[PDB]
mmCIF file of C-alpha atoms in Angstrom:
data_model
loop_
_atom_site.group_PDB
_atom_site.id
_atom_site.type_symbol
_atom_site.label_atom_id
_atom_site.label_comp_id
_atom_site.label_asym_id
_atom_site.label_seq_id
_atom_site.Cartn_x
_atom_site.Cartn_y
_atom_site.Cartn_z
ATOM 1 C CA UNK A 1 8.999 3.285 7.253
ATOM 2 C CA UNK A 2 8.272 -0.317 7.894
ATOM 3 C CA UNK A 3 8.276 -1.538 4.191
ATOM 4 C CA UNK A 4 5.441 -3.769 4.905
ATOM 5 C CA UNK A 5 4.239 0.048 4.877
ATOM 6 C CA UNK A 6 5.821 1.203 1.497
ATOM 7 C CA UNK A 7 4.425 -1.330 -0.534
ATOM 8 C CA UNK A 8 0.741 -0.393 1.583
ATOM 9 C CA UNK A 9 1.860 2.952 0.875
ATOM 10 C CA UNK A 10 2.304 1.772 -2.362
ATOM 11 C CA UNK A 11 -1.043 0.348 -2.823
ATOM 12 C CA UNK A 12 -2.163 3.687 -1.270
ATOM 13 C CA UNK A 13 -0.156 5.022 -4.334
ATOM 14 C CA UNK A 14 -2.270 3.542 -6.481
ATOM 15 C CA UNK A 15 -5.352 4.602 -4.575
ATOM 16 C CA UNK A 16 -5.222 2.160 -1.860
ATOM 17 C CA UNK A 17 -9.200 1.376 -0.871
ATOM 18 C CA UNK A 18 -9.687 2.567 -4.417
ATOM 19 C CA UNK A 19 -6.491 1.366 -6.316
ATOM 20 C CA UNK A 20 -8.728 -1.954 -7.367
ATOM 21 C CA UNK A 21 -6.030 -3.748 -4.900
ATOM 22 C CA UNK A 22 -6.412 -4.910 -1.140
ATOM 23 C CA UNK A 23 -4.121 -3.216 1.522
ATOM 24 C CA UNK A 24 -0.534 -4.993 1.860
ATOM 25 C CA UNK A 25 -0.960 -4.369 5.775
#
Protein backbone atom coordinates (compact mmCIF):
# COMPACT_ATOMS: atom_id res chain seq x y z
CA UNK A 1 0.00 0.00 0.00
CA UNK A 2 2.03 2.90 1.18
CA UNK A 3 1.38 2.49 5.00
CA UNK A 4 1.15 6.14 5.37
CA UNK A 5 -2.08 4.72 3.48
CA UNK A 6 -3.04 1.82 5.92
CA UNK A 7 -3.16 3.75 8.88
CA UNK A 8 -5.42 6.55 6.44
CA UNK A 9 -7.05 3.50 5.46
CA UNK A 10 -7.25 2.88 8.87
CA UNK A 11 -8.78 6.07 9.85
CA UNK A 12 -11.05 5.36 6.82
CA UNK A 13 -11.71 2.14 8.91
CA UNK A 14 -13.03 3.92 11.43
CA UNK A 15 -15.05 6.14 9.13
CA UNK A 16 -12.38 8.35 7.97
CA UNK A 17 -14.19 12.06 7.35
CA UNK A 18 -16.63 10.61 9.84
CA UNK A 19 -14.44 8.39 12.20
CA UNK A 20 -14.26 11.72 14.66
CA UNK A 21 -10.36 11.57 13.49
CA UNK A 22 -8.45 13.70 10.77
CA UNK A 23 -6.95 11.82 7.70
CA UNK A 24 -3.28 10.34 8.41
CA UNK A 25 -2.46 11.49 4.68
Amino acid sequence: EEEAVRLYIQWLKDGGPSSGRPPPS
